């Protein structure tokens, strides 16, 4: 048992629910939190703004200080760090952005960061500002990540297509 409530199962392992993952994290406490990230974690805008918005900017601050050290993340790939008062860890996924050009056959390699953790909040990878069709990006979900995700979707009619929608 956990702590998750009102959630739509999916799948054994997916569920998925019209939410805020700021307002969740805050609620829920959870062990991870994925932040939809980019390579250089700059947090500005969508579910990376709001997160580090909530955290009071100190997830940025955490943020530039591992880019000085280890420069940029790819796409596809993640890092774990704080989740300063939203959850215990942040895992910063990169999936592609659309609106940037990059590869969408990325975004199943950046689901797979998911595998790594035995339960998650996040958003849609890739969806949002990055341009994907979250349709899809739920499929690649369900395809791909094994371990128990708890989706946030905060767009009430997107939400309402992505379970009407599902197969
Ligand atoms: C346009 O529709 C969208 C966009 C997104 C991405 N997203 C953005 N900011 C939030 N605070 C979110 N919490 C859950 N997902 C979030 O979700 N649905």
Same mark, same amino acid.
Do not use: I, R, T
């Given at each position: 048992v956990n702590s998750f409530s009102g959630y739509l199962k999916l799948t054994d392992n997916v569920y998925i629910k019209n939410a805020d993952i700021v307002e969740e994290a805050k609620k829920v406490k959870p062990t991870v939190?994925?932040?939809?990230? &980019? /390579?250089?974690?700059?947090?500005?805008?969508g579910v990376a703004g709001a997160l580090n918005k909530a955290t009071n900017n100190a997830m940025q601050v955490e943020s530039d200080d591992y880019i000085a050290t280890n420069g940029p993340l790819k796409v596809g790939g993640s890092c774990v760090l704080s989740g300063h008062n939203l959850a215990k860890h942040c895992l910063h996924v990169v999936?592609? &952005? /659309?609106?940037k050009g990059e590869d969408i056959q990325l975004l199943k390699s950046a689901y797979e960061n998911?595998?790594?953790?035995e339960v998650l909040l996040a958003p849609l990878l890739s969806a949002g500002i990055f341009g994907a069709d979250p349709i899809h990006s739920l499929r690649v979900c369900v395809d791909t990540v094994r371990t128990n995700v708890?989706?946030?979707?905060?767009?009430?009619?997107?939400?309402?297509k992505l379970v009407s929608s599902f197969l």
């Open positions: 939190v994925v932040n939809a990230a &980019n /390579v250089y974690l700059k947090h500005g805008g999936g592609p &952005n /659309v609106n998911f595998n790594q953790h708890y989706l946030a979707v905060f767009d009430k009619n997107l939400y309402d």
